DNA sequence: TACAAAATTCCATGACA
DNA sequence: ATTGTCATGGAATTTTGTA
DNA sequence: TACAAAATTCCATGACA
DNA sequence: ATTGTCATGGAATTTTGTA
């Protein structure tokens, strides 16, 4: 087969509910399957609507060939289904209860979770403002393979904020 | 005094003998090919020249032609030019007739995120309660982010850029000196993140040229997409942004997106040439492509350009000149020549101003 | 249909053999130096080209580069260019890249009063309750009359010109097409006196160039005379008028007044050369001087000028274009080429318009 | 001496009072001594002031070397005297009761008078509007010497309204 | 070792208020 | 410190498919 | 049958909103 | 029918006063 490349697959999931910051309760998480680059979008609901608005933002940058996700009501809906056919994105669903991703993605999707709780306790209703910092942080972390940052794999260059 | 000897027939340095210098009406006169003219004493000449010039504040030739009607003396023009140099009024109203030297073509930024150019477009027809678009162009790749705003304000800029820099943080942000970006709040925001703010010379969009040229495309596409329909731009910005980031520059043979990512996304007609290389082999090809891009050379100088020389007398254009008021400030001195197209001046007065040639005239005389 | 024979290996006019034309995914493919591309059937190509173009309404090269990613066929560009010719949107939004041909330098009017050029300046800062100056320039001599007015209106124009034409009546009055002069009341006033009204092409001040260039001087002198003082222009107009009428053109070597009168008035520095000739000998010298004046030739054409050809497709500039709307009207046809710089068009639609090249683009493709 | 030329002398006088046209009562008459070119200025009074305003108009065109006039209070005043010294115009006064001008000027100044009465009776309160026509008329009339119109002597060319 | 024509590169022109 | 830019479509040039 | 310098002519540049 | 114009001040050229 062809070697794996960025934009081939976007893994997406919801995190929440969280304590309200700026009237926001959930985080939609988009990780690129090949590079491990992460996008974070604050939403008010784990709904198709909140997803679509969020992903409209992301898809002004790049459009993936595939979005993979769990069978959450928000992703299985026909409105989301139509949205994806419009943009020419194939939809891929993990079987219920057996929610599998790439090895690298589990490992990534895990830090995000750790990192959220970490700077969520003692800073609870302030997390909306720190998303940018959280995001930058993840994307510039050295995955022990391939000794590159998501930032480096995506852009083919160093960052002006290293970690 | 010095005029007695001449009637006597003795030679005076600068008064060509062979012409008969007679006397009439108690004034000294000379018979010349052009006709018979009066020769006034030294102590009167400046008064004369000024009188003639003051009729309509005429330049060298026009002034002289008046004077020539009645008078002659050695080196008339020399004296005329002296006056035109000291006429406050003419100096600050008359336009230039010397053009700026050739523009410069600043080296393209090495890597993306080295430098962002930013500007606001608008006001536009109210769509969804928004009036302005913040435009952010990556210097290297040309990649552009668009953000709709209700005011061209620091608040809005900061809000928008907090989203953008969730992707990456730039070394430098170039902007014009509009209130939005010259505010202290912005500087502080930028300092918090280790971003250098760099400003265009006052009233000179060429400096923001990268972002300005992009505004044109943004507007031109919105326009075409809006033919026949009501001007509902808000919902189009994403489409426009995406469209333009994936448009080839016939010169570069690449889309901004390609230069940022080294591989197309899932968009219409997405290039597949690198489909066989591993991401790594792909990433170095891009690194190579980025360094070998076209780079425009600076054009030849026009016949009558001028260039700034330290200690030159120089005048700055009045920013927002009132009706019937002078289009130029009084003279200033070049303090440092930063590049052959930007200088520091001791203005009005005396403050240090970094300024463009295009907003300067060399004080004549 | 026409694609079976090719896989068979039989030659098709326009499909270079030597390249192997295989089959995959039920599409015909060719292996080319650039890579392996899909060859779509004739009945699909137009749909393809349009799809690619519609992404950002890109021109020839930019469109082709997209298409080239996935497809190949004979004479791709030919098809691209066909689409760009039929894209309503692009045709009426895209700017020109072909410049007007060389300007013309209309012969200077033979005698004074042959032709008057007129225009209004303003609004200016309220002086004495007045806001505008009516400027009237004699075509031949350059002599100028100034009249202060409260509105740029027919009423005022008529009032002012009734004074002026107590001196003499002109054959022709040239004006721009501002409401003041295009009104029926004015035409009637002019007809009563046997004066032909002649109008500039719409939105083109070059045609009023004689009067416009004079506005500059008028403004520039008022300006200089007003440095430091409050803008009290009303009381200055006479002074300005007089000043400027007695100013030499370094090129002609004459003042407008000299060209009108053949002898200076009692003004500062009044030329006395003809003091010895009888008025008659003076009057013929002037008649001779008037015919032998400098006359500027038309400049060379720029590399990429265009010129109007009867039956050409041509587009008129939108007068006062709204925000985000097309800067050009739909296409029209050249009906008559009046001179190489003025044409008659069948516009929108269909009315006859006399129009300048500078307000036209040749419809590309 | 030097041959006589236009602008050497401007003969000026008042005509009136006349029946009111547009609230105007008098005409100031300026004739150029050499050419016979005539200017007419409607005024509300035979006063220094009304003169000065009128002549300010005329002197934006050309300034004479000399103005000649009768000893009317309006011309002998010191305000007029100063006005003339400002513009560098010499003032010349005819002895009282013996009011002499150039031969050509009497002949001219006479037509003006005839022509006024002529188109003043039956058109009485309308004469302000006809001044332009009257003026043009005079300036384009052939003086039997020198078989030239004032217009022709001043401008060195024909008119677009001949008589 | 050479041709006509397609394909590519050149590049002035104008618009970012 | 700070600095003009680049899509566009005819024309001019170069390459291509065939000898 | 000639020189340096003054005097004149050339002419690109910009402004008439 | 309708159409660019011309003051300005350095530079380039021509003329001038003296051999
Ligand atoms: C010349 O008139 C302009 C003034 C402009 C802009 C543009 C133009 C025209 C032009 C536009 C774009 C690029 C180029 Cl190179 C160019 F020449 C802006 O774009 C802009 C901003 O705030 O972005 C602010 N200004 C202000 C005006 O009040 C001042 C800088 C005069
Ligand atoms: C190009 O912008 C201009 C538009 C002008 C004018 C001038 C200019 C600039 C310009 C001025 C003078 C001469 C030239 Cl040669 C020239 F290029 C007028 O002077 C004028 C009038 O009514 O007199 C009306 N317009 C209107 C604008 O609403 C239209 C004709 C666009
Ligand atoms: Mn979930
Ligand atoms: Mn701006
Ligand atoms: Mn701008
Ligand atoms: Mn006008
Ligand atoms: Mn105008
Ligand atoms: Mn009297
Ligand atoms: N640079
Ligand atoms: N002409
Ligand atoms: Zn001055
Ligand atoms: Zn189009």
Q: CATH number for the domain including C187?
A: 3.30.420.10
Strand H: positions under 7 A of a protein C-beta atom: 1-11, 16-18
CA distance B312 to B291: 39
Please tell me whether residues C86 and C64 are part of one structural domain: yes
Answer whether B242 touches A (CB < 8 Å): yes
Question: Is residue C215 in some structural domain?
Answer: yes
Residue of A nearest to B240 (CA): A60
- Non-local CB neighbours of B31 within 8 Å, separated by 6+ positions: B19, B20, B22
Choose one of C261, C293, C325: the last residue of a domain. Answer: C293
Please tell me whether residues B218 and B342 are part of one structural domain: no
Coil, strand or helix at D117: helix
Which residue owns the Cα nearest ligand 1 atom 5? B205
Task: Check: CB of residue C273 under 8 Å from CB of residue B33.
Answer: no
Please tell me whether residues C223 and C162 are part of one structural domain: yes
Report residue D43 as tokens: 């005024």
Please tell me whether residues C282 and C358 are part of one structural domain: no
Task: Check: CB of residue D12 under 8 Å from CB of residue D46.
Answer: no
The total number of residues written for chain A in this structure: 163
Coil, strand or helix at B63: helix
Question: Is residue C205 in some structural domain?
Answer: yes
Residue among B38, B40, B146, B223 with most chain C CBs within 10 A, to mutate? B223
Question: Is residue C109 in some structural domain?
Answer: no
Choose one of C263, C293, C323: the last residue of a domain. Answer: C293
Between B168, B262, B284, which is nearest A151 by CB? B168
Please tell me whether residues B235 and B288 are part of one structural domain: no
* Residue C346 CA to its chain's centroid (Å): 18
Which residue owns the Cα nearest ligand 1 atom 29? B203
Indicate yes or no: CB of B244 within 8 angstroms of CB of C271: no
Give the helix ranges, DSSP H, for chain B: 4-8, 42-53, 60-70, 76-86, 88-93, 154-164, 179-182, 184-192, 209-225, 237-245, 256-261, 279-291
Please tell me whether residues B170 and B217 are part of one structural domain: yes
> Which nucleotide is nearest, taking the CA of residue B306 and each C1'?
H10
- Non-local CB neighbours of C245 within 8 Å, separated by 6+ positions: C143, C144, C255, C256, C257, C260, D61
Domain containing B72 equals: 3-95
Question: Is residue B108 in some structural domain?
Answer: no
- Cα of D11 vs centre of ligand 8, distance in Å, is 11
172-211 in C: which are within 8 Å (CB) of B? none
Coil, strand or helix at B39: strand
Does A70 count as an annotated binding residue?
yes
Coil, strand or helix at B79: helix
Quote the radius of gyration of chain B (alpha carbons, Å). 31
Say how many domains are in chain C: 4
| Pocket around ligand 10 at a 6 A CB cut-off | C 106-107
CA distance B302 to C162: 49
Q: Position of tokens 């170095």? A: B284
Please tell me whether residues C66 and C143 are part of one structural domain: no
Is C255 (CB) below 7 Å from strand H?
no
Report residue A82 as tokens: 């139509």
Please tell me whether residues C124 and C227 are part of one structural domain: yes
Chain B hits for A40, Cβ within 8 Å: 166
Domain containing A133 equals: 1-163
Residue among A132, A140, A143, A151 with most chain B CBs within 10 A, to mutate? A132
A91: region left, alpha or beta (phi > 0 left; psi from -120 to 50 alpha)? beta
Task: Check: CB of residue B189 under 8 Å from CB of residue B158.
Answer: yes
Looking at residue D12, which CATH number applies to its domain?
3.30.420.10
CA distance A21 to A27: 11
Please tell me whether residues B88 and B31 are part of one structural domain: yes
Q: What are the residues facing B37 on neighbouring strands?
A: B30
| Nearest atom of ligand 1 to the alpha carbon of B121 | 23
**Other beta carbons within 10 Å of C339:** 10
Task: Check: CB of residue D72 under 8 Å from CB of residue D42.
Answer: no
- Non-local CB neighbours of B55 within 8 Å, separated by 6+ positions: B66, C243, C246, C247, C268, C269
Please tell me whether residues C289 and C309 are part of one structural domain: no
Please tell me whether residues C40 and C127 are part of one structural domain: no
Residue A101 CA distance to nucleotide E13 C1' (Å): 54
Looking at residue C284, which CATH number applies to its domain?
6.10.20.110
How many angstroms is the resolution? 3.2
B143: region left, alpha or beta (phi > 0 left; psi from -120 to 50 alpha)? beta
Say how many domains are in chain D: 1
Contacts 24+ apart (CB under 8 A), C219-223: C219/B324, C219/C121, C220/B93, C220/B94, C221/B56, C221/B57, C222/B324, C223/B93, C223/B324, C223/B325, C223/B326
Looking at residue B42, which CATH number applies to its domain?
1.10.340.70
Q: Position of tokens 């019937």? A: B324
Coil, strand or helix at A42: strand
Residue of B nearest to A135 (CA): B166
The verdict on the CB of residue C205 being under 6 Å from ligand 2 is yes
Method used to obtain the model: X-ray
Closest CA to A7 of A58, A75, A78, A49: A58
C5: region left, alpha or beta (phi > 0 left; psi from -120 to 50 alpha)? alpha
Please tell me whether residues B241 and B252 are part of one structural domain: no
Choose one of C247, C282, C311: the last residue of a domain. Answer: C247
Residue B78 CA distance to nucleotide G5 C1' (Å): 13
Q: Which chains touch B (3 or more CB pairs under 8 A)?
A: A, C
**In Å, how far is B156's CA from the nearest CA of chain A?**
15
Q: What φ, ψ does residue B362 adopt, rounded to 5°?
A: -75, 125
Which residue owns the Cα nearest ligand 2 atom 2? C205
Does A158 count as an annotated binding residue?
no
């Amino acid at each position: 087969d062809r070697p794996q490349k960025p934009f081939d697959k976007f893994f997406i999931d919801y995190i929440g509910p969280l304590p309200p910051s700026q009237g926001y309760l959930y985080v939609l998480v988009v990780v690129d399957g090949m590079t491990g680059f992460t996008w974070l979008y604050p939403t008010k609901a784990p709904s198709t609507s909140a997803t679509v608005k969020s992903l409209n933002v992301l898809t002004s940058i790049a459009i993936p060939k595939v979005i993979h996700s769990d069978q959450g009501a928000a992703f299985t809906s026909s409105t989301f289904a139509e949205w994806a056919k419009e943009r020419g994105i194939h939809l891929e669903f993990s079987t219920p209860y057996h929610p599998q991703s790439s090895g690298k993605v589990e490992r990534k999707n895990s830090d995000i979770k750790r990192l959220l709780t970490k700077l969520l306790v003692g800073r609870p209703t302030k997390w909306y403002d720190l998303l940018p910092v959280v995001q930058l942080a993840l994307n510039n972390t050295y995955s022990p393979v391939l000794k590159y940052t998501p930032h480096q794999l995506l852009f083919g260059i160093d960052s002006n904020t290293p970690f | 005094a010095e005029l007695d000897q001449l009637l006597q027939g003795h030679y005076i340095k600068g008064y060509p003998k062979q012409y008969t210098y007679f006397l009439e009406d108690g004034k000294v006169k000379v018979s010349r090919p052009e006709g018979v003219k009066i020769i006034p004493p030294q102590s009167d000449r400046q008064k004369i020249v000024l009188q003639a010039h003051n009729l309509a504040h005429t330049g060298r030739e026009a002034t002289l032609l008046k004077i020539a009607n009645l008078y002659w003396w050695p080196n008339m023009r020399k004296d005329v030019v002296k006056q035109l140099g000291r006429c406050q009024q003419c100096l600050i109203t008359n336009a230039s007739n010397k053009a700026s030297g050739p523009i410069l073509r600043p080296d393209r930024p090495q890597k993306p995120f080295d430098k962002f150019f930013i500007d606001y477009i608008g006001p536009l027809p109210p769509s969804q309660g928004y009036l302005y678009v913040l435009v952010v162009v990556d210097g290297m790749t040309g990649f552009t982010w668009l953000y709709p705003t209700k005011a061209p304000s620091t608040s809005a800029t900061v809000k928008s850029l907090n989203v953008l820099t969730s992707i990456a943080i730039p070394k430098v942000i170039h902007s014009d000196q509009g209130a939005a970006f010259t505010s202290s709040t912005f500087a502080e925001w930028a300092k918090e993140r280790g971003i250098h703010l760099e400003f265009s010379t006052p009233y000179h969009p060429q400096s923001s040229g990268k972002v300005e040229r992009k505004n044109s495309d943004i507007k031109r596409l919105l326009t075409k997409l809006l033919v026949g329909r009501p001007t509902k731009w808000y919902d189009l910005l994403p489409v426009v942004q995406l469209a333009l980031n994936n448009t080839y520059s016939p010169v570069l043979k690449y889309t901004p997106h390609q230069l940022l990512f080294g591989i197309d996304s899932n968009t219409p007609f997405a290039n597949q040439d690198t489909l066989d290389l591993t991401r790594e082999e792909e990433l170095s090809l891009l690194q190579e492509i980025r360094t070998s891009l076209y780079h425009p050379s600076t054009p030849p100088a026009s016949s009558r350009s001028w260039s700034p020389v330290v200690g030159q007398l120089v005048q700055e254009r009045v920013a927002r000149p009132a009706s019937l008021r002078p289009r130029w400030h009084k003279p200033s001195t070049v303090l440092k020549v930063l590049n052959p197209r930007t200088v520091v001046i001791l203005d009005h007065l005396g403050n240090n101003r970094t300024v463009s040639i295009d907003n300067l005239k060399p004080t004549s005389h």
